[PDB]
Amino acid sequence: VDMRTISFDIPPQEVLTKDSVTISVDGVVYYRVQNATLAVANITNADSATRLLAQTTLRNALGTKNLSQILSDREEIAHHMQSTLDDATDDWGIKVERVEIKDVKLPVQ
Amino acid sequence: VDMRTISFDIPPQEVLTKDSVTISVDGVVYYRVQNATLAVANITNADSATRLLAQTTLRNALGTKNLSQILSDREEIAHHMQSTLDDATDDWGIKVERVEIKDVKLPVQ
């Protein structure tokens, strides 16, 4: 089991903002296995669980914010997601090291 | 000179909204040569002039609107741009037939 930092792109997630605007946002997660036994102990492997939880964390963070609250605070949303995702992955012995939010797309009807 | 409807994609234009949000918007223009002598009379050819004026019209329409005014009114901005671009192309004997605004991107810093 690789103990180096690992990164993935979160594939774009289309969801409604608090004020019902459709947005699609992509991002990037950097994490490392801090506890390799816990990383292999679960029914879901650790990389797959981190990827699925990253999608859920991003979707939830967006869904509680109005579009304006999302645009001005893109860095803070990342940092708070880094915390939420780090807590959610502790069961797999994963330390989330960094989350980045990239382009916000407002796709047409 | 082809008298059929012609279309092009407006390549994405990065500009500031009235309230200083960076957005990039692409779109599509459908036009037809209604007067073929006027279409070939100018120093700039008609297709190239329509493409350049479409970029200018889009950039200006966006730059006079706050982000919120742009998101809720995407169809109306197209229709008004169709009018503005149709006036601006009359010197080339062009009839603009339709303008469409597609995805709005908010690119990261």
CA distances in angstroms from A91 to A32, A33, A57, A99, B60, listed in the order given: 13, 11, 16, 19, 52
CB atoms within 10 A of CB A107: 13
- What is the spatial distance between Cα A9 and Cα A30, in angstroms, rounded to a whole number? 9
Method underlying the structure: X-ray
Q: Which residues in chain A are closer than 8 Å to B68, comparing Cβ atoms?
A: 67-68
Minimal Cα distance from B74: which residue of A? A108
Interatomic CA distance for residues A53 and A72, integer angstroms: 24
Helices (H) and strands (E) counted in chain A, each on its own, are: 4, 3
- The experimental resolution of this structure, in angstroms, equals 1.8
**Torsion angle in degrees (nearest 10) through CA of B26, B32, B35, B36:** 100
SS3 content of chain A, % helix, strand, coil (to 5): 45, 35, 25
Contact (CB<8Å) A71/B106: yes
Judged by phi (left if over 0) then psi (alpha if -120 to 50, else beta), residue A39 lies in alpha
Q: Which residues, other chains included, contact B9 with Cβ-Cβ below 8 Å and sequence gap of 6+?
A: B26, B27, B28
CATH number for position B84: 3.30.479.30
Candidate from B67, B103, B108 with C-beta closest to A107: B103
Q: Is B2 on the interface with A (CB under 8 A)?
A: no
Q: Is B27 exposed, middle or buried (0-12, 13-18, 19+ CB in 10 A)?
A: buried
Q: Which amino acid, residue B57?
A: T
Query: What's chain B look like in SS3?
Result: CCCCCEEEEEEEEEEECCCCCEEEEEEEEEEEECCHHHHHHCCCCHHHHHHHHHHHHHHHHHHCCCHHHHHHCHHHHHHHHHHHHHHHCHHHCEEEEEEEEEEEEECCC
Contacts of B103 in chain A (CB under 8 A): 105-108
Q: How far apart are CA B58 and CA B84, in angstroms?
A: 10
Residue A45, CA distances (Å) to A12, A39, A59, A90, B22 in order: 22, 7, 21, 13, 39
The residue to which tokens 């700039």 are assigned: B44
Instruction: State both tokens at A75.
Output: 């860095």
Rounded CA-CA distance B86/A4 in Å is 58
Give the span between the Cα atoms of A22 and A103, in whole angstroms: 14
- Domain count for chain B: 1
**Could you list the residue range(s) of the whole structural domain that residue A96 is in?**
1-109
A78: left (phi over 0), alpha (psi -120 to 50) or beta: alpha
What are the distances in angstroms from CA A77 to CA A14, A65, A71, A102, B99?
A: 17, 10, 10, 11, 35
Residue whose entry in the numeric block shows the structure tokens 């807590």: A87
Could you give the CA distance from residue A78 to residue A58 in angstroms, rounded to a whole number? 9
Q: Closest to A103 (Cβ–Cβ): which among B21, B101, B105?
A: B105
- Please tell me the distance from the alpha carbon of residue B49 to that of residue B34, in angstroms, as a whole number: 15
Contact at CB, B21 and A71, closer than 8 angstroms = yes
Chain A CB within 8 Å of residue B28 CB: no
In angstroms, the CA A98 to CA A27 distance is 11
